[PDB]
């Protein structure tokens, strides 16, 4: 269970603070998330007219709603990932 002692030792072993790995992961997935919502709006806007109606409006608000849903899923799931990793992977048992 975490202390400055165990984390400092794991830092010496890794070459970096444990949380820098989790940060890289989370920072990477958040960049990918916004690439995906950006590609979705770009794909649909290219195809914003069908028949005779112009859906340019519904597309931008609709993609903004899906991005908010992904932000919440990403936030929920990788908060769990952060906990698990720091408890079961980047951690030293009580043997010390």
């Amino acid at each position: 269970t975490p202390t400055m002692q165990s984390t400092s030792l794991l830092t010496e072993h890794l070459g970096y603070p444990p949380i820098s790995l989790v940060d890289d992961i989370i920072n990477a997935v958040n960049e990918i998330m916004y690439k995906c919502t950006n590609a979705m709006e770009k794909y649909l806007m290219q195809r914003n007219i069908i028949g005779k109606k112009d859906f340019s409006d519904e597309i931008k608000i609709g993609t903004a709603k899906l991005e908010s849903l992904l932000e919440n899923s990403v936030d929920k799931n990788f908060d769990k990932l952060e906990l698990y990793v720091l408890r079961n992977i980047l951690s030293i048992p009580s043997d010390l």
Partner: protein, 90 residues
């Protein structure tokens, strides 16, 4: 005997698949674009759009996560931590 790097690869992959769940549901993608759905070809565009976005999500996360794991030598470091832990309990 080595389990930690495998836990890491598995939960990372798990977390990624769980995060795009509500993007795989054709019902959520049908209510963010209600009118665009009712159209015949708007359906065809939406369904190909989610396929391509899910693809982009999987391929980029794949490559970027493995790059991180190599940069930080995390597999070696976690293997050595498994060895040290197993050695302590011997």
């Amino acid at each position: 005997e080595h389990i930690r790097f495998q836990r890491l690869v598995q939960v990372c992959n798990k977390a990624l698949e769980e995060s795009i769940r509500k993007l795989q549901s054709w019902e959520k993608i049908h209510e963010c674009f209600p009118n665009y759905g009712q159209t015949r070809e708007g359906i065809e565009n939406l369904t190909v759009c989610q396929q391509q976005v899910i693809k982009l999500w999987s391929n980029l996360s794949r490559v970027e996560f493995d790059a991180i794991f190599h940069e930080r030598s995390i597999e070696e470091k976690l293997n050595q931590l498994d060895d040290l832990i197993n050695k302590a309990r011997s």
